[PDB]
Amino acid sequence: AAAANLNAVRETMDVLLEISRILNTGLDMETLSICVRLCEQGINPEALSSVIKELRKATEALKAAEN
Amino acid sequence: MPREIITLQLGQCGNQIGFEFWKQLCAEHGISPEGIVEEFATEGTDRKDVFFYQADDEHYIPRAVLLDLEPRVIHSILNSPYAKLYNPENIYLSEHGGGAGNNWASGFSQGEKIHEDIFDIIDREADGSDSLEGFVLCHSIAGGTGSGLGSYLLERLNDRYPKKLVQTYSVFPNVVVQPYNSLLTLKRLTQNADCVVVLDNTALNRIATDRLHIQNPSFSQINQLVSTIMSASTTTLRYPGYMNNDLIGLIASLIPTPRLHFLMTGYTPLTTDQSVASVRKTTVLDVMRRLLQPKNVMVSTGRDRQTNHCYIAILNIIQGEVDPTQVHKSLQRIRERKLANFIPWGPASIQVALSRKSPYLPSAHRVSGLMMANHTSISSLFESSCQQYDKLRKREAFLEQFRKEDIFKENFDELDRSREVVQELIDEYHAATRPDYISWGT
Amino acid sequence: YFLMDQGDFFVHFMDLTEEELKKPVDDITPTRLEALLELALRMSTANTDPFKDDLKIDLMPHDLITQLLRVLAIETQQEKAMVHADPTELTLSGLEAFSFDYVVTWPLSLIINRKALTRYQMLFRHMFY
Amino acid sequence: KSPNVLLQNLCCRILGKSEADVAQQFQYAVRVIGSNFAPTVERDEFLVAEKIKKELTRQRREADAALFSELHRKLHSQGVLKNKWSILYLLLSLSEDPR
Amino acid sequence: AVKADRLWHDKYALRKPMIPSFMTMDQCRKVLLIGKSINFLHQVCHDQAADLFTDLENAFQGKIDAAYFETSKYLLDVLNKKYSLLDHMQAMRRYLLLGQGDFIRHLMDLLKPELVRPATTLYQHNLTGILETAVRATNAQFDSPEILKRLDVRLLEVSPGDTGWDVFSLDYHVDGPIATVFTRECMSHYLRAFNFLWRAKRVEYILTDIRKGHMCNARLLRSMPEFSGVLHHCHILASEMVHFIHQMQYYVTFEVLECSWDELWNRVQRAQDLDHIIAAHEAFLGTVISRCLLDSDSRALLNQLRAVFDQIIELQNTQDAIYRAALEELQRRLQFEEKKRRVQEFQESIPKMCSQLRILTHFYQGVVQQFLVSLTTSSDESLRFLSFRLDFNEHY
């Protein structure tokens, strides 16, 4: 029972990773698993994407200033 | 948005070709000599708006400006059945009836003198155009007005509309300054035009004599052939297809890019209307074979045995009842048989578009085809022009009238630069026979 | 077609067949052979013959010489001797397996049968070579 | 506290600096995170398929929609993750801008 | 409760057990066909016992066939002269099968200075208006105004400026009364073939861009040849790719669009029955489907085509970047002249171009080699003839 549930959960996570790969989303495994858990537990995907984009833009601005 | 094309008719030849082009468009669209749509043309399959503007009275008016330095022809046009087609306010004629005197430099100086009126006309037509695609200049390279004023207008259009295509209908000669006019015009076509359709009067005369059995073909008949070619050039506009419906794409396919803009023409059928060709169903393969026949090419290219000339690109607009499967089979057979030699340094561009004819134009042929081809043997014409220029320059021939004009009063350095540009063009055409041509000039 | 009346098409096909002289033509599908034949057709006066669409190209498992020898050696003591025979020692066959067949719909399918079709194919290949 | 720890953990590894050093970035993140507390994604199969098809066409791919369709089945095998559509929309949004 | 697309197909059904033994299968089928034709003429066209058992095997089938023929002929006439069935066929040929030369390449020619520009300032409504304007001067004046209203185009929108070569697809539909001649699946397959021919046209457009650039810019500027070495290193590979992709374009635009469109046009031209025109549409669809070679079972051909497209796109992008850099450098040199380091940097920029063009040439050679091997080793003689024609191209 529990082993089957864990197998189903891991199959779903692997399928989500594969779908992100085929979509070329460019989302890493840890970030994808965090965003998936955030959406399962209840959070606005719009807000999460906006925060991720703001953080990535700050990172790229720091990298450009480094260059 | 409309896709307007402004026609600039320069000198006798340019104005006559523009007049015959507008006549052909009227005949294809069912428009009366006054510009009014004929009752039989209410259900037309073409919207005049592409090349003509529509007046408030449902009159279709050509977006054509006719410029001549001599009153005789303008007065004959205003006394012609087509006088009502053109807007009289869109016709500028220099009151100084002195002309350019068959001098390219004088024609250029005159274009400079009439710059404001001409660029005002071009801007008026552009603003009356929702999405003006470009300008088609119909001129001769050997005269004064059509060469000089045409080059001036090409320069000013390239400067003001650097994103718009410049197509030319350039009449090649069969005037002691003719080599100078020809060299200057070839220079300006090479540097400031996106596409030059070469209309060789020698080849047109040869075709008129050999194929129509016309003893001494008149200029009127040559201009009728030119207008037929111009109609075939606009045939791809009238039938909605999937590709290359604009002058930018036409120029890029035929003049094979803007610097390689010397275009050879081909027309089919080349037969007098009196030649009722017996009951032979013209096949796609027969069409392509006739276009590939040297006797059906409307440009006199030298059979130089030294240069292995090749086709850079070919676009065939086939108008009429054409089976696309027969078009495909004809292209396949042409490739397998290598019936045409293509550039080795670039992809073989052979396109075939099938379109329907205008319901208003009588077609004796259920299927016709025009080929516009950029082919390195066109270089033989530029080489001939260069040899004529060098023959005149070594003799300082016909320079006395040039020295009267300010551009040539001190020296001929602009002539020498034009000769250099034409030499570079010749060398690039020779490179186009070689697989490294793509890298030859750069 | 089979009797090569108006053989200018066969003269044109000689040059296409000459590019294939190493291996028998049966090693290559007949679709491109028929495409070459039809692209040669429209260059010759053949419009007034609405019966060449019933012609098809068959790839025989044996060349003209070999098949002829086996036909003239079967039900005879020659089959044993020429069972080892090959066209490499003789003229090489790269275009002698091309043949014409006439597939026609019923009830005209009753007129033409494979017993006659084999003789047609052999005769046409011999004439063509 | 979860949004705060999420943002700090994301900024400490994705960026070489924390977004508390630039208060504009921190303020923007904290004002973006708290707008709504429920996912706002398209939960229809038709809309998900349309988004995937448009993404693949803008990617110049016209044969991987079957792969995305098959992968979303493996995702929907359990039938206990109702925001898989939410994460697919998140990936769509993160991939649409550069494409 | 039958849609307007199936008033002749499934407006009425057949009951196998409910057919007598004196009436055959084709007899019942023709009876159903005649009844469906009559109902369709009523609904959508809006214009104009012992003996029966015995005559079943003498002339009842002939009467049924004649009635079905006449009803189908009248329905086809009404649809053609009322709902513009032939006009809709010609529209779908022109818009989703490249039957009259204008469309996608002209839109690319117009948008080439604009496609690189951001698509956040360019939206599908402006291009829809441009298409509507330019289709009137085209053959679409033959199409009904509702047809031009139902015809649009999808293009780059909402982008900072990037590739738009592979995003261009005409979408076409027919009205309700005329949609019994052209079914839903028919229009869907027309759209699919339009997308395929759009990919093909984008590949051909990249090839033509390369060709026109290397035919013209060579004769548009005369400068030092020390930079021409890396140009030749790039352009040998670029010309091999040009010839390959022109061969592909000539093969595909001939064996995919043209044959199907000609067969459909000939069948419709001789078609006097709705079943006849439906079969013509189905044959066109099948011919377009057959040569796609993009299905799952054609994974090798699909990957080879994707690799060829990516190679063409990369070559075009690198050629454009090289041309931009050379233009900048030579403009700076001309400004300096008008007003040694410039020449030194212009020469130093050449070796990197040569190395990267050697790498690109090697990759293109490898990919073309694998594609030719896949074509030749296959049991389809069409691919072997394509490989033979490619070798005849004097590039391989």
UniProtKB/TrEMBL annotation, chain A:
Listed GO biological process terms: gamma-tubulin complex localization
UniProt key word Transferase: no
Keywords associated with the record: Cytoplasm, Cytoskeleton
Domain of life: Eukaryota
GO cellular component: centrosome; gamma-tubulin ring complex; spindle
Localization terms from the record: Cytoplasm, Cytoskeleton, Microtubule organizing center
Homology family: Belongs to the MOZART1 family.
Name used for this protein in its record: Mitotic spindle organizing protein 1
Protein source organism: Sus scrofa
Gene field: MZT1
Residues represented out of the complete protein: 10 to 76 of 79
From TrEMBL, chain B:
Tubulin/FtsZ 2-layer sandwich domain span: 243-387
Keyword Mitochondrion: no
Location in or out of the cell: Cytoplasm, Cytoskeleton, Microtubule organizing center, Centrosome
Family of the protein in this entry: Belongs to the tubulin family.
Taxonomic lineage from the root: Eukaryota, Metazoa, Chordata, Craniata, Vertebrata
Gene Ontology annotations of biological process type: cytoplasmic microtubule organization; meiotic spindle organization; microtubule nucleation; mitotic cell cycle; mitotic sister chromatid segregation; mitotic spindle organization
InterPro entries the record matches: Gamma_tubulin, Tub_FtsZ_C, Tubulin, Tubulin/FtsZ-like_C, Tubulin/FtsZ_2-layer-sand-dom, Tubulin/FtsZ_GTPase_sf, Tubulin_C, Tubulin_CS
Stretches assigned to the Tubulin/FtsZ GTPase domain: 48-241
Cellular component terms per the entry's GO annotation: centrosome; cytoplasm; cytoplasmic microtubule; gamma-tubulin ring complex; nucleus; pericentriolar material; spindle; spindle microtubule
PROSITE patterns cross-referenced by the UniProt entry: TUBULIN
Leader peptide range in chain numbering: none
Record flagged with keyword GTP-binding: yes
Name of the protein: Tubulin gamma chain
MF terms in GO: GTP binding; microtubule nucleator activity
Function according to Swiss-Prot or TrEMBL: Tubulin is the major constituent of microtubules, protein filaments consisting of alpha- and beta-tubulin heterodimers. Gamma-tubulin is a key component of the gamma-tubulin ring complex (gTuRC) which mediates microtubule nucleation. The gTuRC regulates the minus-end nucleation of alpha-beta tubulin heterodimers that grow into microtubule protafilaments, a critical step in centrosome duplication and spindle formation.
SMART domains: Tubulin, Tubulin_C
Keyword terms, alphabetized: Cytoplasm, Cytoskeleton, GTP-binding, Microtubule, Nucleotide-binding
Automatic annotation (TrEMBL), chain C:
Localization per record: Cytoplasm, Cytoskeleton, Microtubule organizing center, Centrosome
Family of the protein in this entry: Belongs to the TUBGCP family.
Function noted in UniProt: Component of the gamma-tubulin ring complex (gTuRC) which mediates microtubule nucleation. The gTuRC regulates the minus-end nucleation of alpha-beta tubulin heterodimers that grow into microtubule protafilaments, a critical step in centrosome duplication and spindle formation. Plays a role in neuronal migration.
Subunit structure and binding partners: Component of the gamma-tubulin ring complex (gTuRC) consisting of TUBGCP2, TUBGCP3, TUBGCP4, TUBGCP5 and TUBGCP6 and gamma-tubulin TUBG1 or TUBG2. TUBGCP2, TUBGCP3, TUBGCP4, TUBGCP5 and TUBGCP6 assemble in a 5:5:2:1:1 stoichiometry; each is associated with a gamma-tubulin, thereby arranging 14 gamma-tubulins in a helical manner. Gamma-tubulin at the first position is blocked by TUBGCP3 at the last position, allowing 13 protafilaments to grow into a microtubule.
Protein name (database record): Gamma-tubulin complex component
Source species of the chain: Sus scrofa
From TrEMBL, chain D:
Cell compartments where the protein resides: Cytoplasm, Cytoskeleton, Microtubule organizing center, Centrosome
TM regions (residue ranges): none
Domain of life per record: Eukaryota
Family statement: Belongs to the TUBGCP family.
Name this protein carries in UniProt: Gamma-tubulin complex component 3
Organism ancestry: Eukaryota, Metazoa, Chordata, Craniata, Vertebrata
Name of the coding gene: TUBGCP3
Parent-protein residues present: 7 to 105 of 910
